Structure 1
Amino acid sequence: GISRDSRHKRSATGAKRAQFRKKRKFELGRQPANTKIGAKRIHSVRTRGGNKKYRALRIETGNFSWASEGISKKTRIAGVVYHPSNNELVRTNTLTKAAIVQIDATPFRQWFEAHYGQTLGKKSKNAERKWAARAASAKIESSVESQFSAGRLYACISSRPGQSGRCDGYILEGEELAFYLRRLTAK
Structure 2
Amino acid sequence: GISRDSRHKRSATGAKRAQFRKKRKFELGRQPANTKIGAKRIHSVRTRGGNKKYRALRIETGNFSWASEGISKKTRIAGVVYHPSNNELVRTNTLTKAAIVQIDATPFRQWFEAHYGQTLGKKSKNAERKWAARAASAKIESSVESQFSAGRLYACISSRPGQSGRCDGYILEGEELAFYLRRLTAK
- Over the matched positions of the two proteins, sequence identity in percent amounts to 100
For residue 159 of structure 2, what is the aligned residue in structure 1?
A: 159
CA offsets, 1:1-25, max 9 Å, x none? 0111001111111111111101011
Tell me how far 1:144 sits from its aligned partner.
Answer: 0.5
Output the aligned Cα RMSD. 1.1
The CA deviation at 1:149 is 1.2
Taking the aligned partners of 1:29 and 1:133, their CA distance within structure 2 comes to: 54
1:97 — aligned with what? 97
What's the CA shift for 1:121?
Answer: 7.0
Gap runs ≥5 in structure 1: none
CA contact (8 A) 1:121 1:149 kept: no
Q: Gapped runs of 5+ residues in structure 2?
A: none
Distance 1:119 1:50, change over 3 A: farther
Q: State TM-score, norm by structure 1.
A: 0.98
Q: CA deviation at 1:112?
A: 0.5
Kept in 2: contact 1:36–1:59 (CA 8 A):
yes
Farther-moved stretch of structure 1 (89-98 vs 11-20): 11-20
- 2: CA distance, partners of 1:98 / 1:25: 29
In structure 1, how many angstroms separate the alpha carbons of the residues matched to 2:10 and 2:80?
A: 37
**Number of paired residues?**
187
Aligned residue for 1:144?
144
Deviations 1:154-182 (A, max 9, x none): 00010000000000000000100000001
Matched-pair contact (CA < 8 Å) for 1:112–1:119: no
1:124 to partner: Cα distance: 1.1
Distance 1:168 1:120 in 2: 28
